[PDB]
């Protein structure tokens, strides 16, 4: 029911970034304008990477709202018999589809449908102004996407491989076996999965043919020589036929490279210009290598005023865990807020030494990594995070360096909570939570990005056995023996740790955060001495255990599957801290003030150091050893053992999950501004923090070619329609 709809009173916050924009110089403004346009263009491909009906739903919504804005459409909808709550439910649904670039939650991977009868919405759409202006197109879109817009058939409710889930990273007939075979083939060919999808068809016999389609402007036709053009052929792999193609989301990426070229003229230094040239190469040919070189040049660009990144970056929504969803952000540095994080970087190399693993399992040389607090102007794609550690190319992360980023105006939008909505806490805890959540989050995000993802040495072996470490002298602390497991050529973290890689790495980074947060030097880096560092520590740990309880919302018990990486990680940390016993953390079911099942989380401040730190140290050592050896077997054992959701006493997590759902709060949607070019200058357009405001932000988002983007998405959808 309410699990698969967005509530009509869902929170909507407006991204606050007038001041960061007003800081920018004219050239910086035009640079950010063209980068934002490129990012917005590329984010449309997320619709294709989400569900088969998502591009149609986007086209239909954007056409509807081009013809009539929310207020114009309200009059029609109410004249056609809808109620104000039903029209509001439609507005909320459209705003969700816009904010996620799809009809599935980017945070939860669950479908959501309009919360009103389908026949009434049909009455609205077919009688609309866009219907009277384009009967064929609107009626075709409706007949194509309507019942899929509403259907909650159990196989449609969650993203996933196989038949019990939905994914467009693969064709409908693909299973985890097909993804595993595809990943082995890609590893054998040194072709990254990031910008690729996998389609499986059959001949008359029934023999599966595999297509690995690359995302590129150019198709399968003679173009200027690349490392990509040689790879466009058929292969045989373990008896299966594979076909490497390209040309995926081609006109979308065409628009993207147009805007990237235009931004290249207003680049500040040669680092930005060369990174943009390499991004154009990556998006036009299909080369993950070109994107790697661009990312190298990007890491070299230190402390720019307009920070940005774009491409098929994160692999959270690939049900297998290696393919990347498109994203792209433009942001302005916030030097005042970046002061504390540059401070954290100042003592970072010496801070790593305190982590619970020997320096043979740590990166060889500490590279001074850029860490800035950013104010977002654009974050296209399915979701806006709080912070990033990028690039995700671990080779680059170990040789050239990496960038850490804390999105300040996103953290600020998320900082606000009310006392009533703070569930599963006793009243004594809620006050400390309210008072310290923000600063504790600065601490936790800094530790998570810089010392979490930024720590760890992966043992890689060459094709001639050239270990990047010392096989003779490096000893495994968990067995006392020498190292026996490692990564090979083409093998990556996602490649070997597939479905659990994201959640596992996130769990490691946030355990690092919880662990190094006791260090008083860290707490004074953020200006919290013993008078208040006490409380910031306790609040960080209480927030962690509460998040571990709340994570039960993102677990499908029928599939025994975790749908969100960070929440699975926090449930793992909660179960770990429950494991040590000694009355540290206690989940106790209660009855709420409203007469419904509630729960309470008790965390003892004293046993955080005496009991919590030993368990976290043990756990961190296990995680890091298994990560550095690439021990998929033992890593899966550990993680999928802690991530196991059971109704075993006393915790009874399966019974708690019903309470967590019954008292869940929907994540707020975030309205983002647009930028316009008045020929000479660049102006910033903000919007109401509402469903209608987000709708308007997407109606004014593509003023030049909106109706063309709708048809591009429709065409790319119809072309692949046979896959689902």
């Amino acid at each position: 029911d309410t699990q698969y709809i967005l509530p009509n009173d869902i929170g909507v916050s407006s991204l606050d970034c007038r001041e960061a924009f007003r800081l920018l110089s004219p050239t910086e403004r035009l640079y950010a304008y063209h980068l934002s346009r490129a990012a917005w263009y590329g984010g449309l491909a997320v619709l294709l990477q989400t569900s088969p009906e998502a591009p149609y739903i986007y086209a239909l919504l954007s056409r509807l709202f081009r013809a009539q804005d929310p207020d114009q459409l309200r009059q029609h909808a109410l004249a056609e018999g809808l109620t104000e709550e039903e029209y509001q439910a439609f507005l909320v649904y459209a705003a969700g589809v816009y904010s996620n670039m799809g009809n599935y939650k980017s945070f939860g991977d669950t479908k959501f449908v309009p919360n009103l009868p389908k026949e009434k919405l049909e009455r609205v759409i077919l009688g609309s102004e866009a219907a009277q202006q384009h009967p064929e197109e609107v009626r075709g879109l409706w007949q194509t996407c309507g019942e899929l817009m509403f259907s909650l058939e159990p196989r449609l409710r969650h993203l996933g491989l196989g038949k019990e889930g939905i994914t467009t990273y693969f064709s409908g007939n693909c299973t985890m076996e097909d993804a595993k075979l595809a990943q082995d083939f890609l590893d054998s060919q040194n072709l990254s999965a990031y910008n690729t999808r996998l389609f499986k068809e059959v001949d008359g016999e029934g023999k599966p043919y595999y297509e690995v389609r690359l995302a590129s402007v150019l198709g399968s036709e003679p173009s200027l020589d690349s490392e990509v053009t040689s790879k466009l052929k058929s292969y045989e792999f373990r008896g299966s036929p594979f076909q490497v193609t390209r040309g995926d989301y081609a006109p979308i990426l065409q628009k993207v490279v147009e805007q990237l070229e235009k931004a290249k003229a207003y680049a500040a230094n040669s680092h930005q210009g060369q990174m943009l040239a390499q991004y154009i190469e990556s998006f036009t040919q299909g080369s993950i290598e070109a994107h790697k070189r661009g990312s190298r040049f990007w890491i070299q660009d230190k402390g720019p005023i307009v920070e940005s990144y774009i491409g098929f970056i994160e692999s959270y929504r690939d049900p297998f865990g290696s393919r990347g969803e498109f994203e792209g952000f433009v942001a302005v540095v916030n030097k005042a807020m970046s002061a504390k994080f540059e401070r954290l970087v100042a003592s970072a190399e010496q801070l790593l030494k305190e982590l619970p693993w020997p320096p043979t399992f740590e990166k060889d040389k500490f590279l001074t990594p850029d860490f800035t607090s950013l104010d977002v102007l654009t974050f296209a794609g399915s979701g806006i995070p709080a912070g990033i550690n990028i690039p995700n190319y671990d080779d680059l992360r170990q040789t050239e360096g990496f960038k850490n980023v804390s999105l300040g105006n996103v953290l600020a939008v998320a900082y606000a909570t009310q006392r009533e909505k703070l569930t599963f806490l006793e009243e004594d805890d809620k006050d400390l939570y309210i008072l310290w959540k923000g600063p504790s989050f600065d601490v936790q995000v800094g530790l998570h990005a810089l010392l979490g993802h930024g720590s760890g040495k992966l043992f890689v072996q060459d094709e001639k056995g050239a270990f990047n470490f010392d096989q003779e002298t490096v000893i495994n602390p968990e067995t006392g023996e020498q190292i026996q497991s490692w990564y090979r050529s083409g093998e990556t973290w996602d490649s070997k740790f597939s479905t659990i890689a994201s959640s596992y790495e996130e769990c490691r980074a946030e355990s690092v955060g919880l662990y190094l947060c006791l260090h008083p030097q860290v707490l004074e880096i953020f200006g919290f001495e013993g008078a208040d560092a006490e409380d910031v520590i306790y609040v960080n740990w209480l927030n962690m255990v509460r998040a571990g309880l709340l994570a039960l919302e993102f677990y499908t018990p029928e599939a025994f599957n975790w749908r969100q990486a960070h929440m699975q990680a926090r449930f793992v940390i909660l179960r770990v801290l429950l494991e040590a016993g000694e009355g540290l953390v206690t989940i106790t079911p209660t009855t709420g003030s409203d007469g419904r099942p509630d729960a309470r989380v008790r965390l003892d401040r004293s046993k955080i150091r005496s009991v919590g730190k030993p368990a976290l140290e043990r756990f961190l050592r296990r995680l890091q050893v298994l990560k550095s050896t690439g021990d998929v077997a033992g890593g899966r054992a550990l993680y999928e053992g802690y991530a196991t959701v059971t109704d075993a006493p006393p915790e009874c997590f399966l019974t708690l999950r019903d309470t967590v759902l019954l008292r869940k709060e929907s994540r707020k949607l975030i309205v983002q501004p647009n930028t316009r070019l008045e020929g000479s200058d660049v102006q910033l357009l903000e919007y109401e923090a509402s469903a209608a405001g987000l709708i308007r932000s997407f109606s004014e988002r593509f003023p030049e070619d909106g109706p063309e983007l709708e048809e591009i998405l429709t065409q790319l959808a119809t072309a692949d329609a046979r896959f689902w």
């Binding site: 995700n392 953290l411 993802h453």
Partner: peptide, 4 residues
């Protein structure tokens, strides 16, 4: 890698 990278919520609220």
């Amino acid at each position: 890698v990278x919520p609220w």
